[PDB]
């Protein structure tokens, strides 16, 4: 009855942007990005790959409510470093890892005979 429609978990809406970026108040070089229509799956990986990088000081993902599908990623980086750049570098590294693993597992399956 009162339940939200299931497609609202993975579908964007009107007037909704996938990423919204707002600087942190009383914080230097810090910004919170509101990922919308996305969940834990993206956030934990993004935060971990940010944590691997040295230049970024702070990286955290918060889920505002289990009801809705959104999460906030706060990133704070070195002076002279765009936090968006750090996010992009982490994303590209993730993608490279994914492709490498996909090709390696494909060759492994071709080796497999059953």
């Amino acid at each position: 009855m009162n339940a939200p429609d299931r497609f609202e978990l993975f579908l964007l809406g009107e007037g909704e942007s996938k990423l919204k970026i707002d600087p942190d108040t009383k914080a230097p070089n810090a910004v919170v990005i509101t990922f919308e229509k996305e969940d834990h799956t993206l956030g934990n990986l993004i935060r971990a790959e940010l944590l691997n990088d040295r230049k970024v000081l702070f990286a955290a993902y918060k889920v505002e409510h289990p009801f809705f599908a959104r999460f906030k990623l706060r990133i704070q980086t070195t002076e002279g470093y765009d936090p968006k750049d750090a996010l992009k570098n982490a994303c590209n590294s993730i993608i490279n890892k994914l492709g490498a693993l996909k090709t390696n597992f494909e060759t492994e399956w071709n080796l497999q005979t059953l």
Partner: protein, 264 residues
């Protein structure tokens, strides 16, 4: 051999594949498992219209069961979401229409299987919507039993969906995840009355990892990079395609984030 994560497969079959993930962070492993369970798309029945029903089962029960029935979804890439198509309700390229009619002619109970199911719309060269049957006899998954004098006639429209919307679009049944077989990293603290080793069963995966030795200090630096996993197939998509599609869908989500960042 490519720089980065390495995979070695223990055993293979059409249903299950067991493999050892190597040189990875754990966050992407659990994220990939989430994507595999939910995110990767599948074709399944999303609409049913019942012209005639005389079965003791009510129509809603049947619609739920039909939504659960497994259908082939390997060529789902050529198929497009019914919401992304330009059709009014259902296009041949966006939906697959399948009709079922059965009469209990036999005085003995006439059961109904997933095999007894016809396809109406054009396949258009695709391998989509074939009702998958793993039964040794070849008969489908049982749906109903019809007494003599009973018939059931209905039409189903099957569309693409994500397991997030409904569990029917689910590509895998059981996922097996393990690490720290020796619990050297001590990520969990065992509960014991007398002794943890005697009370807690030893895992199989323990064999492949080097045993720990008492008298060695706890390794602070060590972080989990070796993982053991096993993947099962509902059969709607083969196992290898299921996992590689999980990888690809996760990459696509990352790429869409990147695209939105570029747009801003």
């Amino acid at each position: 051999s490519e720089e980065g994560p390495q995979v070695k497969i223990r055993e293979a079959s059409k249903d299950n594949v067991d493999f050892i993930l190597s040189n990875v962070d754990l966050a992407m492993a659990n994220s990939l498992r989430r994507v595999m369970i939910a995110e990767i798309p599948t074709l399944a029945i999303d609409s049913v219209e019942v012209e005639t029903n005389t079965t003791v089962l009510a129509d809603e029960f049947i619609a739920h069961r039909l939504g659960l029935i497994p259908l082939q979804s390997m060529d789902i890439e050529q198929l497009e979401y019914s919401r992304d198509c330009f059709c009014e309700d259902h296009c041949d390229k966006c939906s697959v229409v399948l009709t079922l009619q059965a009469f209990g002619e036999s005085e003995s109970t006439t059961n109904v299987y997933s095999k007894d199911l016809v396809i109406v719309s054009n396949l258009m060269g695709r391998n989509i919507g074939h009702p998958i049957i793993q039964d040794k006899e070849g008969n489908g998954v049982l749906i109903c039993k019809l007494r003599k004098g009973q018939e059931l006639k209905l039409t189903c429209v099957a569309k693409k969906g994500i397991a997030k919307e409904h569990a029917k679009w689910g590509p895998a049944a059981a996922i097996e995840f393990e690490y720290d077989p020796w619990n050297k990293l001590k990520h969990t603290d065992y509960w014991y009355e007398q002794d943890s080793a005697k009370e807690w069963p030893q895992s199989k995966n323990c064999e492949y990892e080097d045993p720990p030795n008492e008298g060695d200090p706890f390794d602070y630096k060590a972080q989990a990079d070796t993982f053991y996993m096993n993947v099962e197939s509902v059969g709607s998509i083969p196992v290898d395609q299921v996992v590689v599609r999980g990888i690809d869908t996760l990459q696509k989500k990352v790429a869409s984030i990147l695209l939105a960042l570029t747009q801003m």
